[PDB]
Amino acid sequence: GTVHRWRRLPPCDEFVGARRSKHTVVAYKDAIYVFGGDNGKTMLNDLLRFDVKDCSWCRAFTTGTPPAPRYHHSAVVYGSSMFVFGGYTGDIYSNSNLKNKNDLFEYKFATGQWTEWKIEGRLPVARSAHGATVYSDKLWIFAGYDGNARLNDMWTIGLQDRELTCWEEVAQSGEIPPSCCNFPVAVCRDKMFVFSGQSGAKITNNLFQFEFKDKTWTRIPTEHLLRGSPPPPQRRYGHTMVAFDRHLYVFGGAADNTLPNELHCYDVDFQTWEVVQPSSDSELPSGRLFHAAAVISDAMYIFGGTVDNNIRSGEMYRFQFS
Amino acid sequence: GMTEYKLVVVGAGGVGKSALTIQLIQNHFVDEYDPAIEDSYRKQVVIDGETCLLDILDTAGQAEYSAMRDQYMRTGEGFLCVFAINNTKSFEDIHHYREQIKRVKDSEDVPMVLVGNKCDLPSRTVDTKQAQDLARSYGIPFIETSAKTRQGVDDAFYTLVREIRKHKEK
Ligand SMILES: Nc1nc2c(ncn2[C@@H]2O[C@H](COP(=O)(O)OP(=O)(O)O)[C@@H](O)[C@H]2O)c(=O)[nH]1
Numbered sequence: 001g002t003v004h005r006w007r008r009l010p011p012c013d014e015f016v017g018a019r020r021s022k023h024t025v026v027a028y029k030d031a032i033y034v035f036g037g038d039n040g041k042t043m044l045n046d047l048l049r050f051d052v053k054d055c056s057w058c059r060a061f062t063t064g065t066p067p068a069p070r071y072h073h074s075a076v077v078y079g080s081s082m083f084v085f086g087g088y089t090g091d092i093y094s095n096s097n098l099k100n101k102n103d104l105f106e107y108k109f110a111t112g113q114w115t116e117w118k119i120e121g122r123l124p125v126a127r128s129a130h131g132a133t134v135y136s137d138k139l140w141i142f143a144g145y146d147g148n149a150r151l152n153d154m155w156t157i158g159l160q161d162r163e164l165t166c167w168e169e170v171a172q173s174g175e176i177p178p179s180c181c182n183f184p185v186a187v188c189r190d191k192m193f194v195f196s197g198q199s200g201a202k203i204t205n206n207l208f209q210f211e212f213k214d215k216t217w218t219r220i221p222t223e224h225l226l227r228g229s230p231p232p233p234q235r236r237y238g239h240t241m242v243a244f245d246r247h248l249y250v251f252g253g254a255a256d257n258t259l260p261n262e263l264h265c266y267d268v269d270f271q272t273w274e275v276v277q278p279s280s281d282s283e284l285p286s287g288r289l290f291h292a293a294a295v296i297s298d299a300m301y302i303f304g305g306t307v308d309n310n311i312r313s314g315e316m317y318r319f320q321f322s
Numbered sequence: 323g324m325t326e327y328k329l330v331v332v333g334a335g336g337v338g339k340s341a342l343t344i345q346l347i348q349n350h351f352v353d354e355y356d357p358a359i360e361d362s363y364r365k366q367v368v369i370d371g372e373t374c375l376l377d378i379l380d381t382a383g384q385a386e387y388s389a390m391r392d393q394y395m396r397t398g399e400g401f402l403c404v405f406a407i408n409n410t411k412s413f414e415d416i417h418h419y420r421e422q423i424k425r426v427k428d429s430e431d432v433p434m435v436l437v438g439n440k441c442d443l444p445s446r447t448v449d450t451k452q453a454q455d456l457a458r459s460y461g462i463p464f465i466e467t468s469a470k471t472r473q474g475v476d477d478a479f480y481t482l483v484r485e486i487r488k489h490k491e492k
C-alpha cells in the first residue's frame with residue numbers, strides 16, 4: 001500500500017501446488033501464472049494462477065497436452081498466449097532420461113489451450129538456464145547451457161503464424177557477454193539488458209545492453225562509480241531482473257557465499273546504481289535464488305525460490321514501486 | 323580408443339580442488355584462485371593405453387546448483403572427494419558429499435576416489451589410517467596428494483578414470 005513497500009502475500013499452499021524453484025512466472029491481466037520447476041523430488045509441469053485482486057491461489061484450468069515436466073525453462077507473453085521454450089526434462093528421482101529441450105509450447109489464456117509449435121528447419125541447440133524475451137513480434141532467446149558448454153548465441157522466432165514461422169540465428173555484433181546461464185533478462189527502451197549470471201571463469205557484475213535495431217552488444221561503463229556513484233550489486237546468479245519506468249530492478253540470487261536481499265535499482269538513463277530503501281512497515285523477503293518475477297501495474301511480484309539450506313519456497317512477495 | 327570421461331571434483335571450500343585441477347592441466351601450482359569460481363577444464367591424455375578425453379568440473383558455491391553443475395552432477399561419470407589433511411572439518415564433510423552423489427545418481431556403485439590433499443604440509447591433523455579406513459569401508463581408493471609438489475596429482479585423477487572403466491565392465 002505504501003510506496004517502496006514489501007508486502008507478504010499469501011503463499012501458495014501445497015494443496016494447490018508444491019513449493020518450488022527454477023520455475024517461470026508470467027504476468028497477464030491481473031494474474032500471475034507459475035509454470036514448471038522443482039519441488040525437491042521431481043520436476044513439475046502444472047500451471048498455477050495467482051489472482052492479484054483477491055490474492056487467491058489456484059490450479060489453472062488446462063485442456064491440451066502440456067509440456068513435459070521441466071525446470072530452468074523460459075516463459076514469455078505475446079498477446080493472449082504464453083510461450084514456454086527449452087528447459088531440462090527427465091526423472092530426477094531415478095536420474096534417468098535426462099535431456100535439455102528446444103521445443104516451443106503455446107498457452108492461450110482465453111481457452112487454456114496447450115499447443116506445441118512443431119517448428120521445421122534448423123533449430124537452436126537444446127538448452128537450459130537461457131534468457132528469453134519478446135520484441136518486435138518475435139521471441140528472442142539468448143545464451144544458456146546445452147549439456148556440453150555454456151552458450152552465447154541468440155535466436156529469434158516469429159510469434160504471429162505458426163505455419164509460416166521458423167527459427168533464425170541472430171548474427172550478434174559488439175562486446176558479446178561471455179557464455180552465460182542462470183541470469184535474468186529485461187527489456188527497456190529499445191534495448192535488452194543482462195546483468196551478471198553464471199559465466200564460470202568470467203563471472204563478474206557487468207551490465208550488458210543489447211540494441212535490438214542493429215544487433216549490437218555493449219558493456220555499460222559503470223566504472224564511473226569511482227566518481228561518486230554507488231557500486232553495482234555484487235556478482236550473482238539465479239536472480240531476477242525486471243524493468244519499470246526506465247529503471248532496472250535486480251533482486252535475489254546467490255552471490256558467492258551469500259544470498260543478499262537488497263533491492264538494486266539501475267537508472268538506465270543516468271547509468272547509475274542504487275539500493276532501494278524499503279518502508280518502515282515492510283515485510284522483507286528473505287534471501288533466495290531461482291525465484292521468478294513479474295510486474296503488474298506498478299508493483300513487482302516475487303514467487304518461489306530456494307531460501308537457504310535447501311528449503312524450497314512457495315512464498316509470494318509484492319514490492320510496491322512508486 | 324577415444325572415450326570421454328566426465329569428472330567432478332567435490333569437497334569443502336579451500337581443500338585444494340581448484341589448485342589441484344589446475345596442476346593436472348598446466349603443471350603449475352596456483353596459490354590464490356577465486357574460491358567461488360566454478361568452471362570446466364578439458365585435457366586429452368592417454369590412460370591405460372587409450373586416449374582419454376577428460377571433462378573436469380572444478381566445483382564451488384554453496385547454494386542451489388547452477389544449471390551447468392546440476393547437469394555435471396547428474397552426468398558425472400566419476401567423482402573426486404577431496405579433503406585437506408590439515409583440516410578436520412573437510413574430512414568430516416566427506417560422508418555428506420558421498421550421500422549427495424549417491425542420492426543424485428540413484429546408485430550405490432558410483433565411481434569415486436577419496437583424496438587427502440595438502441600432504442606436503444607438516445601440520446597433519448587427519449591420520450592417513452583414518453581416511454584409509456573410511457575409503458576401504460566405502461570400497462573406493464584413497465590417494466594422498468599435494469597440488470603444491472604435484473605428488474599423486476596424476477595418480478588420483480587417473481585412478482578415478484580406472485574406477486569408471488571398472489564400473490563399466492560389470
Ligand atoms: N600446502 C598446500 N597448499 C595447498 C595445496 N593445494 C591448495 N593449497 C592452498 O589451499 C588454498 C585453497 O586452495 P583452492 O584450490 O583454491 O581451494 P578450493 O578450490 O576451494 O578447493 C589456497 O591458498 C592454496 O594455495 C597443497 O597441495 N599444498
Ligand SMILES: [Mg+2]
Nearest residue numbers: 339340357382
Ligand atoms: Mg576453487
